[PDB]
């Protein structure tokens, strides 16, 4: 219905709780066909499910960390999606973090390292300028649009965040500059600021629990958001329906981000 | 499809160029039930063709300046929409705003006066807390939501907007507050900020016209959005698909909103 | 020294326990000469004091509830600093909020009024925009500036602030409002945000003291501010140091509104 | 008088022109210790000049692209400050930017690089990271703060400003996260936003000239800020009268932040 006959390339599959599973989920329940990505041939088995869910056209190595490695991926995406009158891209989602996890235990200044910020600068960060540098043709012929995935570390102290709250602020600076850079062929720039969300693997690390349990005790909503309604928020900004909106930060988040102190967490 | 058997209040609608026209219509193309209000008897011919248009179930009057006019509505609802197993309300629509023409006129500390001023804040920001208020029961029995129409004066300062700029900052806060208020009982709140909209009447003031041409000339789509753009993104706020966002601000604006200079005002 | 025969008007003085009382403290410490303002006769008595405990030329009545009572407050002001070649004045400072207290308890929805509403918008918000108004000659005259207080209620939901959440979001608009009216005649317009303030009246209350211990717990500096703390900086934005300054929110809070979620708070 | 034996670390002064100049000039003034540093020997002969003209305490070296090169910095700091019972550095001052020239010409997604992003990341917002690492021992012994110099670029977007602007949101980042990680022991950490400044050097570039320009078309004030009101400022929240403020950002732009669009604009 919604996306039929549009394309998406999704980046940042690791499994079955990623974000960008239920992203690339929504995108095909509206008739959208997809390329999905990897980045390592250990990764690559989750998302061959995920091209197998969702019937993709196309499963395509790409290490945001390798210019090289975007580059020939997007050649690759040429072949399918850039022949033809029909040529071109409708959205590109980038759904890819990393910090060295060292940088993200305890004290900031402790624990904040030159190439620890570096690495999470690169891939969480520049990541994203890269996808669009190389996208940007494909998705000028089809005015398609851009979204990424961030998190409030970026504008607010969390304990443990550290040096990826700074390159989420680098990221969502980067949406704003992409989006003047791009508005002009047409293509839009967006993010979603996701809530934490309650997955399996998360739940097992006690401080990632606790922060998940303050989380839903500040949160007006009085939970956790899930990663279906992220999925369809991201359909909605990667959708025909957003056409007016670029350079937002859009917050999935149960309106987390709005409270400073909580009735319940008065005790 | 997306909002089958789902029932929305609209207010705010004066004629087939408001927003909250094209919000109605988005609203009604995706399924919806719609009750109208209109605030006095010569609007009251324009809200008419509107129940036309969308098969209202109901044309309501409200003015939302008097607190007995917003409960005998909200009665008047309840008899539609509060009987049976099925009772309820899946959205409120608040797209009202007022301040008297000679506070928008020039320098804003010689324009400002008291009585403009709260007339302002009394119809543009105090409504929407005045609709919650008589909306509680409905919504909470169909845990639905609130939206509200805002606009970057609250924030940033644009010539003759003056005291409404004033009165926007306030419901901005009003859609924080209500969403924490709410939020227990499964209520969203949210609020777009739309751009400026090229419309008939508004081309009509060299003044306006001129807000609207240097908007075009910062925004990064180098364009004014669309009364459907904008009722688009209500849709999406009002439905399934944003039941993860709560005390949001959503700019409907082309990416204005991000843009510090633009290369193209240079000159 | 550094306000070595500089004039300034300050408002808003209840008492010994006043922010405005440390504000007049910090001024007259630096050389400057005050006139004070008092609302009513039951709050004159304070008032005298502090012209006793800082010389000052004057002490003036001034409801900002009546427009009539600025004017005239402006009038004996002319009398003392608007005759000679020296003629003007270098601040005013506008340290006044009221909500009526049955708005600031509980439910927001529940609890606030169109009538508290109008009273908290007109009293805390409207009254800066009435004082800009008529000091906006003597200001002009000494390229002088506005101050006022502000709170992050405005921006970030805290219990029972309610309709002074609105009052202040709209008074920072204010700000941003009259800076831009203002700037031309080379005056400037700032505010403080300070954050909550242990006095003697407010540890009374057990709901307070509560929101002060939770400060405490999530500020980065581990404790609240005090006037002095607040005096010393409008101080500062009052003097020729902020020259540059213009349009600011300035906090004084310890660094709370900067944390999402303290390590403290985490149990 | 202000800052009578209190010893600060000021970095980035490369001649009478920098921001840091002007900072260092308003701290001796108030009757501080300085220590300035320099990236390399070329640039060593203007840092000299500035120890004479403020009597510096010593010049040592400090390359923040280098770990090693600021803990040596630190150790030779110790010798002069770390020794007795008034052991401890009452502020440091970071004034450092760099991006490679290319990355900051003309389309923010052609322009942008892997590793002139990497290099912009690393030398403008890690470097203070690595300085309050560095300081942390002394500046907790005499509970002192760190100031660093930030810009609108940040959370706006300016063209050509680019991948600084990526660095700029990161380096605010980096300010909320140190103000929380040593707040425990005393310590402020906060930013001035300066606006930008017309130079000798500055004005040599038609493009910058013509931002100057707009700016000042912009901004309340209708001028530019220049270095003295930065250096004032950034003396303030050095100072005792700031002990109340972390966290900050403080805008020294005459305004401009504030505007959307001004009337000068509106042609
Ligand atoms: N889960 C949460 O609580 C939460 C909340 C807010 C923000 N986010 C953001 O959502 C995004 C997605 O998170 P998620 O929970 O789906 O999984 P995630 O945190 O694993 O996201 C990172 C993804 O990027 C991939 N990746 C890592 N290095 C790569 C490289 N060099 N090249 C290519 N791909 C690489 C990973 O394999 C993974 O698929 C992240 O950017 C995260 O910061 C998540
Ligand atoms: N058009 C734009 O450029 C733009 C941009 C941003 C924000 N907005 C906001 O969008 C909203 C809708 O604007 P619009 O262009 O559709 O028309 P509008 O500006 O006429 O919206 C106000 C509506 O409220 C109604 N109203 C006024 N007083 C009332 C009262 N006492 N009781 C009940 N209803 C009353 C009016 O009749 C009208 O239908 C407004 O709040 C406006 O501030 C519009
Ligand atoms: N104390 C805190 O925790 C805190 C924190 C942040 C913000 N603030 C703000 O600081 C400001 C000063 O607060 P405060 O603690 O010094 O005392 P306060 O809260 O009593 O400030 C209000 C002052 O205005 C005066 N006033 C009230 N109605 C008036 C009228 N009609 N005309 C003239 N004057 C009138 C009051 O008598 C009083 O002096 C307020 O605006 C408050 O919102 C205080
Ligand atoms: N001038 C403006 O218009 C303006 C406006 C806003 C922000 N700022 C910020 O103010 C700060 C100071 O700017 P400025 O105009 O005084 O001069 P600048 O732009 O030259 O500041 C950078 C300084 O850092 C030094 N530096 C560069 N690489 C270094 C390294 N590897 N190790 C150590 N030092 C190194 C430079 O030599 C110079 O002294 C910058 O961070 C800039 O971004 C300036
Ligand atoms: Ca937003
Ligand atoms: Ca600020």
Redesign the interface.
């Known amino acids: 219905?919604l996306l039929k006959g549009q394309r998406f390339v999704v980046t940042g599959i690791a499994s079955k709780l990623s974000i960008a599973w239920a992203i690339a989920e929504s995108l095909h329940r509206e008739g959208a066909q997809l390329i999905l990505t990897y980045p390592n041939d250990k990764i690559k088995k989750r998302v061959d499910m995920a091209a197998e869910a969702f019937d993709a056209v196309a499963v395509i190595e790409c290490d945001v960390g390798s210019?090289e490695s975007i580059q020939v991926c997007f050649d690759e995406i040429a072949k399918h999606w850039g022949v033809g009158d029909d040529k071109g891209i409708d959205g590109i989602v980038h759904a890819i973090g990393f910090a060295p996890a060292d940088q993200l235990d305890g004290?900031?200044?402790?624990a904040?390292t030159?190439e620890g910020?570096?690495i999470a600068?690169?891939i969480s960060?520049?990541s994203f300028?890269?996808l669009?540098?190389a996208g940007?043709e494909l998705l000028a012929a089809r005015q398609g649009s851009l979204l990424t995935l961030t998190y409030?570390?970026?504008?607010?102290?969390?304990?443990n965040?550290?040096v990826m709250?700074?390159?989420?602020?680098?990221?969502?600076?980067?949406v704003?500059?992409?989006?003047?850079?791009?508005?002009?062929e047409?293509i839009?720039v967006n993010a979603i600021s996701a809530?934490p969300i309650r997955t399996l693997a998360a739940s097992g690390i006690k401080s990632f629990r606790?922060?998940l349990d303050?989380?839903e005790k500040?949160?007006?909503?009085?939970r956790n958001?899930?990663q279906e309604?992220?999925g369809?928020?991201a359909?909605?900004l990667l959708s025909?329906?957003?056409?007016?909106?670029?350079?937002?930060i859009?917050?999935?988040?149960?309106?987390?981000?709005?409270?400073?102190?909580?009735?319940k967490?008065?005790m």
Request: net charge negative; proline share 3%.
């Open positions: 219905m210019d004290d900031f200044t402790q904040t030159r910020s570096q600068h690169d960060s520049y300028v890269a669009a540098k940007r409030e570390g970026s504008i607010s102290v969390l304990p965040y550290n709250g700074m390159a989420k602020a680098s990221l969502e600076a980067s704003r500059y992409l989006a003047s850079s791009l508005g002009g047409g839009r809530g606790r922060m303050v989380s500040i949160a007006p909503l009085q958001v899930s309604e992220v369809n928020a359909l909605f025909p329906w957003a056409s007016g909106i670029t350079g937002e859009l917050f999935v988040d149960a309106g987390f981000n709005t409270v400073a102190i909580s009735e967490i008065m």
